[PDB]
Design an enzyme around this catalytic site. Structure first.
Site, PDB file in Angstrom:
ATOM      1  N   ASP A 185      38.925  -3.010  53.685  1.00 38.02           N
ATOM      2  CA  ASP A 185      37.982  -2.031  54.208  1.00 38.02           C
ATOM      3  C   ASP A 185      36.560  -2.506  53.945  1.00 38.02           C
ATOM      4  OD1 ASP A 185      38.322   0.677  55.505  1.00 38.02           O
ATOM      5  OD2 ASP A 185      36.833   1.197  53.983  1.00 38.02           O
TER       6      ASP A 185
ATOM      7  N   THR B  20      34.085  -0.063  59.952  1.00 36.99           N
ATOM      8  CA  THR B  20      33.160  -0.406  58.881  1.00 36.99           C
ATOM      9  C   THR B  20      32.938  -1.907  58.754  1.00 36.99           C
ATOM     10  OG1 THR B  20      34.925  -0.425  57.233  1.00 36.99           O
ATOM     11  CG2 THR B  20      33.845   1.660  57.690  1.00 36.99           C
ATOM     12  N   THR B  21      33.856  -2.722  59.263  1.00 34.63           N
ATOM     13  CA  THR B  21      33.699  -4.169  59.256  1.00 34.63           C
ATOM     14  C   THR B  21      33.139  -4.689  60.568  1.00 34.63           C
ATOM     15  OG1 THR B  21      35.566  -4.386  57.730  1.00 34.63           O
ATOM     16  CG2 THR B  21      34.917  -6.350  58.946  1.00 34.63           C
TER      17      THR B  21
ATOM     18  N   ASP C 258      41.679   6.002  56.826  1.00 35.16           N
ATOM     19  CA  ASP C 258      41.234   5.473  58.113  1.00 35.16           C
ATOM     20  C   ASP C 258      42.039   6.068  59.264  1.00 35.16           C
ATOM     21  OD1 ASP C 258      39.743   3.878  56.387  1.00 35.16           O
ATOM     22  OD2 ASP C 258      39.948   2.103  57.657  1.00 35.16           O
TER      23      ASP C 258
HETATM   24  N1  LIG Z   1      47.271  -5.315  67.382  1.00 37.75           N
HETATM   25  C1  LIG Z   1      46.016  -5.754  67.627  1.00 37.75           C
HETATM   26  N2  LIG Z   1      45.781  -6.681  68.578  1.00 37.75           N
HETATM   27  C2  LIG Z   1      44.541  -7.127  68.837  1.00 37.75           C
HETATM   28  N3  LIG Z   1      43.447  -6.698  68.186  1.00 37.75           N
HETATM   29  C3  LIG Z   1      43.538  -5.758  67.218  1.00 37.75           C
HETATM   30  C4  LIG Z   1      44.858  -5.229  66.870  1.00 37.75           C
HETATM   31  N4  LIG Z   1      44.661  -4.340  65.882  1.00 37.75           N
HETATM   32  C5  LIG Z   1      43.332  -4.310  65.616  1.00 37.75           C
HETATM   33  N5  LIG Z   1      42.669  -5.177  66.395  1.00 37.75           N
HETATM   34  C6  LIG Z   1      41.206  -5.422  66.437  1.00 37.75           C
HETATM   35  O1  LIG Z   1      40.650  -5.768  65.168  1.00 37.75           O
HETATM   36  C7  LIG Z   1      39.348  -5.197  65.036  1.00 37.75           C
HETATM   37  C8  LIG Z   1      39.097  -4.738  63.605  1.00 37.75           C
HETATM   38  O2  LIG Z   1      39.880  -3.615  63.236  1.00 37.75           O
HETATM   39  P1  LIG Z   1      40.065  -3.259  61.679  1.00 37.75           P
HETATM   40  O3  LIG Z   1      39.858  -4.526  60.896  1.00 37.75           O
HETATM   41  O4  LIG Z   1      41.373  -2.525  61.556  1.00 37.75           O
HETATM   42  O5  LIG Z   1      38.905  -2.222  61.255  1.00 37.75           O
HETATM   43  P2  LIG Z   1      37.336  -2.522  61.421  1.00 37.75           P
HETATM   44  O6  LIG Z   1      37.031  -2.190  62.854  1.00 37.75           O
HETATM   45  O7  LIG Z   1      36.700  -1.581  60.441  1.00 37.75           O
HETATM   46  O8  LIG Z   1      37.207  -3.974  61.079  1.00 37.75           O
HETATM   47  C9  LIG Z   1      39.245  -4.077  66.056  1.00 37.75           C
HETATM   48  O9  LIG Z   1      38.052  -4.250  66.819  1.00 37.75           O
HETATM   49  C10 LIG Z   1      40.440  -4.228  66.975  1.00 37.75           C
HETATM   50  O10 LIG Z   1      40.004  -4.471  68.310  1.00 37.75           O
HETATM   51 MG   LIG Z   2      40.131  -0.484  61.579  1.00 41.09          MG
END
Ligand SMILES: Nc1ncnc2c1ncn2[C@@H]1O[C@H](COP(=O)(O)OP(=O)(O)O)[C@@H](O)[C@H]1O
Ligand SMILES: [Mg+2]
Ligand SMILES: Nc1ncnc2c1ncn2[C@@H]1O[C@H](COP(=O)(O)OP(=O)(O)O)[C@@H](O)[C@H]1O
Ligand SMILES: Nc1ncnc2c1ncn2[C@@H]1O[C@H](COP(=O)(O)OP(=O)(O)O)[C@@H](O)[C@H]1O
Ligand SMILES: [Mg+2]
Ligand SMILES: [Mg+2]
Ligand SMILES: [Mg+2]
Lengths: 523, 308, 534, 46, 534
Positions: free
Chosen positions: C71, C104-105, C402
């Site tokens: 996170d 948040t990232t 989240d």
């Molecule tokens: N199954 C998936 N396939 C492709 N992209 C994904 C998938 N799950 C999440 N993402 C991508 O990863 C990015 C980061 O999400 P996450 O790390 O969970 O939280 P944050 O947005 O706070 O970094 C998001 O912009 C999303 O588009």
């Molecule tokens: Mg996320």
């Protein structure tokens, strides 16, 4: 740290700098203000060498004290200047310079420019010189009585005043004997050829100037005479020893007789030198360098008395006294170089030391003043006072003009300047009249050190000096009353008082031009 | 870059890069560093995109070759006779510097110097050691000068002889002083007469030397710098001055080839070979003063002014 | 780097600011570049924690406790930063978490990318305010393009598959993706149980997120009711109560006591005996009042004493004591009961009902917990998290936070953009087109904004091992060729690039908030041109 | 011997003092110059 | 940060303001020592060593400057003193004012290249305008022109009011050391006038010696101290017992040679001295030493020998008397001789007692006239400041006699140039125009400073001056107004050409050129890297 000038560089500027310089100068003045006049008191100074200096001499005092303010440095330097130039007035100059700066402080506080003050001071200095030269009187330097009075008027303000006649005659005789002319150049060198030797003990009343010289020496060999009544004297700069050569004169011996022959050759060399000396038939031989024992043997065989290691200055005085000529190669010795003129060589024991006298000379152009007294300090003060006396005699014999003392000259000049100032219509009339009234400090200080009423006496004196033929009227530093200098007898050398006024005015000019002190920077 | 004591390795490498540009071209030492820094700053985002440094390197080599092609196509040929083109190149090079209000003065000098020290028909390069630069304080940059002859900071030893017209000059790599073998030598005196003889024979040796010098017509004498032996004794200076010869000693063993190239002199190391054909003829040799800011020896005019 | 460097044109001391010699200052383009360097460092730290293949960070606090997390807000909060621009980036992530609870990232990576592009624009000489204004223009364009390409999902309680897909997308990047659908299902059911559909509000105080080491992550479940870390007051009471009529009380089962300073004076043996009988009768009356109300269980907030405990046991009234105010409130809300301040005010209508009240053990521990569940229509809920260590438990707590926040954001606005970098690629395309139609000098700033938006797909590709530029260019070309803003990065290598088919789903409010927050903070950072500090 | 003020009293007087006051004011102005207007910038103080 | 240099770095307006501050510091040090109303400074060298002075070059040499942009102005004053001998304060003041105004323009964001071009143009045109409109021929003016130039240089010095007499001394001395050489050009080689100092009698008592004054004395007290028909032998070798040189050793193997060898060691020098004295030499000056053995030969001959004389004093005595300095008694015949033609002559040589010391006076030398000056003041501080002031005056008279052009003083030239250049700037560009206007305005710092030091209304006085000069440059019937400048004793403009306030043209010309060069060099700096020492 981004500086432009190095730290430790402190810069002051403006009226603070001006007032600081003036206060430092007038402090130097207040230090010795009481050491002026006949009724002054002594000061005991403590040297860094555990020594003591008991004196009344302004330059002695200021030379023994140490300061850090550059204005005070300049004042001490002008005292040194007065002493080196005329050898008198070393406290009159300090007091006058202090008073000039004091009166200039006024005009500086009142928005006048230092250059305006300085131009006024220079006008006043020229007019002072004019007034002194008008009021001066001549001297018949052939009149020993007039000269003795001139010297008394200069030493009365010093400790030797109790032995005034003695010290005056000593100084006069010394200077008249040191008076010398060669190739059209008159020379009174009372620094190289009038010598003061202080032997503690005895009494001051037996102190004398010798018709000859005296050194602290004994015969090289006790078989030599210590008393000779018409000595023919030889002076040498060379060693009567056998010394080495300037080159690498290394010898190489393979034969037996050669070592002994070399040592005998050395002996024969000494014999030949001593014979080159004996051929002139002297009675005394005086050397600045050594004399070997074999040389002593040969001289004694010739009935010669030798003195081994004399100083170059003492040898030069012996030359001037006995009429000899220092030589450096006895082969080059001539009858004209032999010293005839000494009337007696004596080597006598004063206390537990042996002193060589070459006295009874005829026409000696050098002398030794033999001072006797209670202690080295008393004799140091007597020697300084005698330096004053001899320097005054010298200044007179050079410029025979005299001016009246007791502040009479200061009051006459102040009056003349005030009278000339009434024609002045610009803005410099004020500083001009101010230095005129700043000359009055000499009689003021005299009255103060005598213990009388400055206000009343100085008023009566300023009033006396408004009459016509009253430029000789002054004050006694011994009774606190106004007198005619024609009746008292205190007459200073015009050269001395001229140098005093000039040094004072120029020191004031310098410290007035000065502003914007800077410090710290390292050479 | 050389003066700022850079510490990072890449920055050190850029310093070396600018020095290499200064060697190969002597101009562009700032452009090259800026180009390098910019190429690397672009490699940043390339790496971020995820390209390999080797691919970046090879593609940069490709771009370099294409860019050399492009610049050559842009270029136009030049004749060294095109003095206006040379003046414009020099003025462009100077526009960047503090001396750019003086370009009108220092561009024609920068063109003359090079055009005087090279054969324009055969030259393929230039040795800027043929161009000597002498920094002397005083005056202004408008006082810079191009001296076709020779200039020396070494002082003249004679008093009274500062100017020489129709000057015959000789280089002396031997010492004008008492004889001294390279082996340990002494003069053993065992009689007083041998002393007078030693002084006299030394005088005679020195006088014979200076006479063999005078006999050639030499009036200017450049003496090499000599440690281990006095190259110019006071006797020798006395005799040379009496013979009206200007003397400049303390010449350095590295300025010798330059001085010869300049004033046609030939360096002499033995008095036997000191003849007239080993001299250099100069229309003037003068110790000129620079408004109380020092002195300079100027040998101007030359019968053999060789590419210097 | 110094406050004042003159010391005077006259040599006199020049002191203007206090401790100016110990103070520093950075002005102008170097200050801007220092800011950009700090922000780029933070963003390059964070970009590896982005996406399913993103890795975690192990944070160690002042006292040496370890926190493993993915996170960004938690990372930047645990991070001991000294740089003020990095502090601004921590604030940025915290703001994204406050408003949204996800992204948040992404916010930090995107802001770092915007500043990295502004770096080249400043090198080319553009005014930082012109850069900020071009960024605002491009951000507005991208926000409207998001509203344009957005999709909508049904937020009903009948078909929860879209919400489960959204929550699964949220939990794809977290360590709890081993129980992906179980965690998504329980986050959805939690928010839907506790959510005001008419108000469109979700109070997270109604969601108790409890963690207990032991068990497995798979043991994490949703309790429709309450769990308490307490046990029955007497060790011989029963550990299970079914169809429990619950009396919730904030009165300690002790003799009454005035709040005012009081002194009851005993002056005789009769007074003493009366006091004794008063105490006895108070205890008996308390227990009798609780019994006559019909309760089978009592839950006090303030603990009680030996007589009351034994009387409860004797009268078959299991009881919990020292229950906290918040859990008392949750128990009332869940069981349908009313909180009673004194026994006299207790009635059969103020009681709560739970179909099961049980005491639960945790192996070889001695620790007991109380579960209250089988309520009729619990408007409160509990998520009980199990696992093999406190690190994965804390990570599961924040991950489920989240997911809950994402379902909350759907309840607030059901509009949905497709992820995998697809929305960023589409917004970059829209911004590029508008920059092409823009003739002012901000064209460059908008192109930079597009190149910055393209950093999220690049980061996803890099973390997934793909070649960033290759993958992004192919999917961008496909997006413009076949109009499909749901084409993104195949992080999981399912073959297809279609995020609408992979069910990778983000909230429109989430992406819009990312873009807006990143742009606003980048603007405030570019507006700074002078730093002062001791 | 005795000083008018307490040791450590710093007195700057005159045209230099006035010019230094003006220069310090110039410093204070410089500290805020770049915040002026629509193209103005912000300051970060700690 | 990014730049890893191990040092400090100033950049931009910071370093420009610093450079101007440093230059201003240096100029404010010396501003108070400008003009007839300027005042002197004390300088204490960390040990109590005192130096009184008004000479700006002396002040800036004695100071310990730390800033390089201030070292530049110190070197500027030094260079002005080397090339001119006067203007060392005005040049520093003008350089600093040019720096101030040019930095003001650079703050207004006029490019420093443009400021530098404008400054160069204004310098060139100011030099031309001076040479064309503001010069007076010393031939048209006579000898009172030289006296007035000397008095103008002596104003602001401690020989100011006595200028009426010191100027006569200086002029007589320079005309005495006048000599014409090959090329028939008249040369006035000052630094060949000897200047001795001797505290004592007043300044008015300072002496001009027709001849030469030597800070030396005879070697033996038995020698005479006056000789009338002086035959002078100048020797550059020592008269001592002869030592065999390094490569000569005496090795005796027959003791009979030791005596003759040792005696020869002295007879050699004896023979040389006899050869010298046989020609008639009664005065023998030597740069080397003279042993006592030799001094005795001089004593017996009745000659005056002097040892350890300085090489430069000997060169001057030789040039003045007609002698030849001999490094050896050696001719082109392999013998040792001394010719009477190598002798010099003088109508008298005496050892004179100045204060408590003694020096030698060589009076009325033939084959050339020479000049020495013995300055007489109250102490060494006065004597040193008088020496420096007299050097300034000698240099000024030398310049007036070499170039026969003078310009008026009192800010006349600076006012005329301010007017003319503020009118001339209108033609050259638009930013170089501002640069030229600022050059013009800077030139006014000289009359401004003169009036400030005079404690007068600088504004009103310089306005009146500029009004006069504008009238002169716009009304061809009043061109005589060019000669108007400040009268600092009354605070009113005045015809300085008729008042006698003259300066050699070279003073103003070189001042302008050097100040411009310094300003350009300092203005070219836009960065500063100060490396930490090792
Ligand atoms: N199954 C998936 N396939 C492709 N992209 C994904 C998938 N799950 C999440 N993402 C991508 O990863 C990015 C980061 O999400 P996450 O790390 O969970 O939280 P944050 O947005 O706070 O970094 C998001 O912009 C999303 O588009
Ligand atoms: Mg996320
Ligand atoms: N008997 C005296 N009565 C009054 N004044 C005297 C007398 N004797 C000397 N003076 C004065 O005292 C001054 C000399 O004092 P002195 O202590 O010698 O100081 P300095 O010689 O350093 O000036 C001169 O002004 C002199 O005229
Ligand atoms: N009598 C005078 N009246 C007005 N101005 C003068 C007079 N004498 C000199 N000046 C001016 O004083 C200025 C500087 O003099 P000074 O400080 O002595 O020498 P410098 O500054 O040349 O080293 C010059 O501009 C000169 O014209
Ligand atoms: Mg006395
Ligand atoms: Mg270039
Ligand atoms: Mg001058």
């Amino acid at each position: 740290p981004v500086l432009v000038l190095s730290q430790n560089t402190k810069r002051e500027s403006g009226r603070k700098v001006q007032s600081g310089n003036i206060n430092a100068a007038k402090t130097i003045a207040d230090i010795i203000r009481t050491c002026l006049g006949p009724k002054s008191m002594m000061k005991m100074l403590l040297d860094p060498m555990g020594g003591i200096v008991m004196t009344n001499d302004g330059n002695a005092i200021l030379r023994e004290i140490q300061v850090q303010h550059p204005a005070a440095k300049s004042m001490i330097e002008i005292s040194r200047t007065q002493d080196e130039e005329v050898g008198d007035g070393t406290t009159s100059v300090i007091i006058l310079a202090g008073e000039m700066l004091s009166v200039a402080e006024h005009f500086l506080e009142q928005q006048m420019h230092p250059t305006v003050v300085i131009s006024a001071y220079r006008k006043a200095l020229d007019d002072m010189i004019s007034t002194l030269k008008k009021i001066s009187i001549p001297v018949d330097i052939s009149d020993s009585d007039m000269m003795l009075n001139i010297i008394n008027s200069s030493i009365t303000t010093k400790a030797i005043s109790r032995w005034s006649s003695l010290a005056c005659n000593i100084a006069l005789d010394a200077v008249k004997m040191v008076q010398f002319e060669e190739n059209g150049r008159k020379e009174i060198d009372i620094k190289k050829y009038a010598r003061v030797e202080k032997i503690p003990g005895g009494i001051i009343e037996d102190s004398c100037v010798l018709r000859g010289v005296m050194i602290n020496k004994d015969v090289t060999h006790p078989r030599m005479r210590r008393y000779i009544k018409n000595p023919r004297i030889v002076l040498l700069d060379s060693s009567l020893e056998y010394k080495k050569g300037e080159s690498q004169t290394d010898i190489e011996i393979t034969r037996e007789e050669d070592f002994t022959r070399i040592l005998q050759m050395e002996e024969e060399y000494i014999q030949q030198l001593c014979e080159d000396i004996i051929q002139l038939k002297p009675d005394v031989v005086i050397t600045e360098k050594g004399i070997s024992d074999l040389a002593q043997h040969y001289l004694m065989r010739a009935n010669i008395t030798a003195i081994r290691r004399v100083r170059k200055t003492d040898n030069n005085r012996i030359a001037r006294a006995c009429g000899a000529r220092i030589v450096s190669r006895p082969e080059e010795l001539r009858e004209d170089d032999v010293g005839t003129g000494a009337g007696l060589l004596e080597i006598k024991k004063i206390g537990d030391e042996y002193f060589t006298f070459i006295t009874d000379c005829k026409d000696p152009k050098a002398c030794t003043i033999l001072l006797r007294g209670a202690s080295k300090e008393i004799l140091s003060e007597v020697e300084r006072n005698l330096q004053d006396a001899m320097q005054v005699c010298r200044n007179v014999l050079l410029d025979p003009q005299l001016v009246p003392g007791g502040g009479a000259s200061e009051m006459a000049v102040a009056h003349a300047l005030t009278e000339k100032s009434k024609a002045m219509t610009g803005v410099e009339q004020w500083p001009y009249r101010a230095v005129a009234q700043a000359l009055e400090v000499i009689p003021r200080t005299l009255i103060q050190n005598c213990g009388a009423s400055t206000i009343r006496l100085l008023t009566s004196l300023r009033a006396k000096h408004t009459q016509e033929n009253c430029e000789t009227w002054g004050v006694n530093g011994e009774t606190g009353t106004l007198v005619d200098m024609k009746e008292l007898g205190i007459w200073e050398p015009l050269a001395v008082k001229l140098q005093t006024y000039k040094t004072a005015v120029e020191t004031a000019v310098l410290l007035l031009r000065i502003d914007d002190i800077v410090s710290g920077h390292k050479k | 870059l050389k003066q700022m004591q850079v510490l990072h390795p890449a920055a050190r490498m850029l310093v070396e890069l600018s020095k290499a540009q200064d060697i190969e071209a002597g101009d562009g030492t700032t452009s090259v560093v800026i180009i390098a820094g910019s190429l690397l700053d672009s490699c940043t985002k390339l790496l971020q995109k995820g390209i390999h440094p080797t691919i970046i390197s090879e593609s940069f080599q490709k771009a370099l070759e294409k860019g050399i092609e492009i610049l050559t196509d842009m270029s136009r040929p030049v004749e060294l006779s095109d003095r206006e083109t040379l003046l414009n190149s020099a003025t462009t090079s100077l526009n960047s510097k503090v001396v750019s209000q003086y370009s009108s003065l220092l561009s024609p000098m920068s063109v003359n110097a090079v055009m005087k020290v090279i054969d324009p028909a055969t030259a393929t390069s230039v040795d800027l050691r043929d161009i000597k630069i002498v920094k002397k304080l005083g005056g202004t940059i408008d006082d810079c000068e191009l001296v076709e002859g020779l200039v020396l900071t070494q002082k003249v030893s004679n008093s009274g002889i500062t100017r020489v017209e129709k000057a015959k000059i000789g280089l002396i790599q031997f010492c004008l002083s008492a004889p001294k073998t390279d082996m340990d030598n002494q003069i053993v005196v065992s009689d007083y007469a041998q002393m007078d003889r030693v002084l006299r024979e030394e005088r005679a040796y020195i006088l014979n030397l200076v006479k063999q010098i005078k006999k050639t017509g030499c009036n200017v004498l450049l003496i090499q710098k000599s440690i281990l032996r006095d190259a110019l004794s006071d006797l020798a200076l006395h005799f040379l001055n009496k013979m009206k010869i200007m003397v400049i000693k303390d010449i350095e063993r590295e300025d010798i080839e330059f001085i010869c190239k300049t004033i046609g002199t030939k360096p002499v190391a033995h008095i036997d070979q000191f003849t007239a054909d080993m001299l250099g003829s100069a229309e003037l040799a003068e110790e000129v003063n620079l408004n109380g800011s020092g002195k300079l020896l100027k040998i101007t005019g030359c019968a053999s002014p060789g590419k210097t | 780097s110094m406050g004042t460097l003159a010391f005077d044109e006259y040599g006199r001391p020049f002191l203007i600011i206090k401790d100016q010699d110990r103070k520093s200052r950075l002005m102008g383009l170097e200050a801007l570049k220092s800011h950009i360097m700090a922000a780029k460092a933070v963003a390059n730290t964070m970009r590896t924690s982005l996406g399913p293949n993103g890795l975690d960070k192990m944070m160690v606090d002042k006292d040496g406790d370890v926190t493993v997390t993915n996170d960004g807000a938690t990372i930047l909060s645990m991070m001991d930063v000294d740089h003020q621009i990095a502090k601004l980036m921590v604030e940025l992530s915290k703001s994204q978490d406050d408003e949204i609870g996800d992204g948040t990232t992404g916010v930090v990576v995107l802001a770092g990318a915007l500043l990295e592009e502004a770096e080249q624009l400043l090198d080319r000489g553009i005014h930082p305010i012109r850069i900020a204004d071009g960024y605002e223009q491009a951000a507005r364009v991208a926000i409207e393009h998001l509203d344009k390409i957005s999709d909508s999902v049904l937020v009903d309680i009948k078909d929860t598959e879209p919400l489960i897909q959204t929550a699964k997308t949220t939990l794809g990047s977290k360590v709890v993706n081993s129980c992906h659908r179980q965690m998504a299902e329980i986050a959805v059911n939690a928010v839907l149980t506790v959510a005001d559909m008419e108000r469109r509000d979700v109070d997270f105080e109604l969601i108790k997120v409890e963690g207990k080491v032991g068990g497995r992550l798979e043991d994490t479940k949703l309790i429709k009711g309450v769990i308490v870390d307490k046990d029955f007051s007497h060790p011989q009471m029963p550990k299970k109560v079914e169809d429990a009529k619950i009396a919730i009380l904030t009165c300690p089962f002790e003799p009454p006591k005035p709040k005012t300073k009081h002194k009851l004076d005993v002056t005789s043996v009769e007074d003493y005996k009366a006091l004794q009988k008063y105490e006895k009768e108070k205890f008996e009356e308390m227990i009798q009042q609780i019994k006559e109300t019909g309760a089978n269980l009592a839950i006090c907030q303030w603990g009680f004493d030996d007589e009351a405990n034994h009387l409860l046991l004797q009268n078959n009234l299991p009881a919990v004591r020292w229950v906290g105010g918040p859990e008392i409130e949750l128990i009332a809300i869940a069981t349908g009961g009313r909180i009673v301040p004194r026994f006299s005010e207790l009635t059969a209508e103020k009681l709560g009902f739970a179909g099961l009240v049980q005491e639960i053990s945790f192996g070889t521990t001695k620790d007991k917990m109380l579960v209250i569940e089988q309520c009729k229509n619990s408007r409160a809920v509990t998520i009980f998290i199990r696992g093999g260590n406190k690190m994965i438990i804390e990570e599961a707590k924040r991950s489920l936070h989240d997911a809950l926040c994402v379902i909350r954001n759907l309840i607030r606005d059901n509009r949905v953009v497709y992820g995998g970098g697809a929305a960023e690629i589409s917004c970059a395309l829209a911004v590029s087109q508008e920059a092409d139609k823009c003739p002012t000098l901000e064209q460059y700033a908008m192109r930079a904004f597009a190149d910055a938006l393209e950093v999220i797909p690049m980061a996803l590709s890099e973390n997934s091992g793909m070649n960033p530029i290759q993958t992004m260019t192919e999917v961008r070309a496909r997006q413009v060729k076949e109009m499909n803003p749901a084409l993104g990065i195949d992080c999981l290598h399912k073959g297809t690039n279609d995020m609408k088919q992979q069910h990778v789903i983000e909230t429109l409010i989430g992406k819009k908030q990312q873009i807006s927050l990143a742009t606003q903070m980048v603007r405030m950072i570019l507006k700074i041109d002078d730093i002062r500090k001791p | 011997p005795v000083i008018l003020l307490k040791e450590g009293t710093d007195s700057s007087q005159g045209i230099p003092q006035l010019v230094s006051n003006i220069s310090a004011c110039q410093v204070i102005a410089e500290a805020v110059r770049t915040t002026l207007g629509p193209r103005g910038m912000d300051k970060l103080i700690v | 940060g990014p730049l890893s240099v191990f040092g400090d770095r100033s950049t931009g307006e910071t370093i420009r303001s610093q450079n101007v501050m440093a230059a201003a510091s240096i100029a404010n040090i010396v501003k108070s020592s400008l003009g007839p109303v300027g005042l002197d400074k004390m300088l204490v060298d960390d040990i109590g060593d005192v130096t009184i002075t008004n000479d700006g070059a002396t002040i800036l040499k004695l100071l310990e400057v730390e800033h390089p942009a201030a070292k530049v102005l110190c070197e500027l004053a030094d260079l002005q003193d080397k090339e001119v001998g006067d203007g060392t304060t005005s040049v520093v003041i003008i350089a600093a004012e040019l720096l101030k105004n040019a930095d003001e323009l650079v703050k207004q964001k006029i490019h420093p290249t443009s400021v530098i071009s404008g400054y160069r143009l204004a310098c060139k045109e100011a030099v031309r305008y001076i040479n064309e409109n503001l010069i007076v021929n010393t031939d048209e003016l006579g000898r009172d022109c030289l006296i007035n130039a000397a008095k103008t240089s002596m104003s602001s010095k401690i020989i100011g009011i006595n200028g009426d007499f010191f100027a006569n001394m200086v002029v007589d001395a320079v005309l005495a050391i006048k000599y014409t050489d090959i090329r028939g050009q008249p040369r006035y080689p000052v630094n060949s006038v000897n200047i001795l100092k001797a505290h004592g009698r007043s300044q008015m008592e300072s002496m001009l010696i027709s001849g030469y004054a030597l800070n030396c004395v005879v070697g033996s007290q038995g020698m005479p101290k006056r000789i009338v028909n002086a035959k002078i032998a100048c020797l550059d070798f020592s008269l001592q017992k002869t030592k065999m040189k390094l490569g000569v050793q005496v090795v005796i193997t027959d003791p009979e040679k030791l005596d003759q060898i040792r005696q020869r060691e002295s007879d050699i020098t004896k023979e040389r001295i006899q050869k010298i004295l046989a020609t008639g030499a009664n005065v023998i000056l030597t740069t080397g030493g003279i042993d006592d053995m030799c001094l005795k030969y001089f004593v017996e001959a009745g000659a005056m020998a002097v040892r350890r004389v300085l090489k430069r004093d000997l060169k001057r005595i030789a040039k003045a008397s007609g002698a030849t300095i001999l490094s050896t008694l050696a001719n082109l015949e392999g013998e040792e001789t001394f010719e009477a033609a190598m002798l010099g002559q003088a109508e008298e040589v005496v050892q004179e007692r100045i204060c408590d010391d003694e020096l030698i006076l060589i009076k009325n030398t033939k084959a050339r006239t020479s000049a020495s000056i013995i300055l007489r003041g109250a102490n060494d501080f006065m004597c040193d400041e008088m020496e420096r002031s007299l050097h300034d005056a000698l240099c000024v008279v030398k310049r007036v006699l070499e170039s026969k052009s003078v310009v008026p003083g009192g800010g006349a030239v600076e006012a005329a140039l301010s007017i003319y250049l503020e009118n001339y700037a209108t033609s050259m560009g638009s930013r170089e125009q501002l640069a030229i206007a600022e050059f013009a305005r800077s030139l006014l710092v000289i009359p401004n400073t003169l009036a400030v030091n005079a404690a007068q209304d600088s504004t009103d006085l310089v306005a009146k001056l500029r009004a006069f000069h504008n009238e002169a440059q716009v009304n061809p019937e009043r061109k005589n107004l060019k000669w108007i400048g400040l009268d600092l004793s009354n605070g009113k403009p005045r015809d300085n050409k008729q008042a006698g306030v003259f300066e050699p043209t070279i003073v103003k010309v070189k001042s302008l050129k050097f100040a411009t060069e310094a300003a350009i060099t300092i203005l070219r700096i836009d960065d500063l890297i100060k490396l930490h020492p090792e």
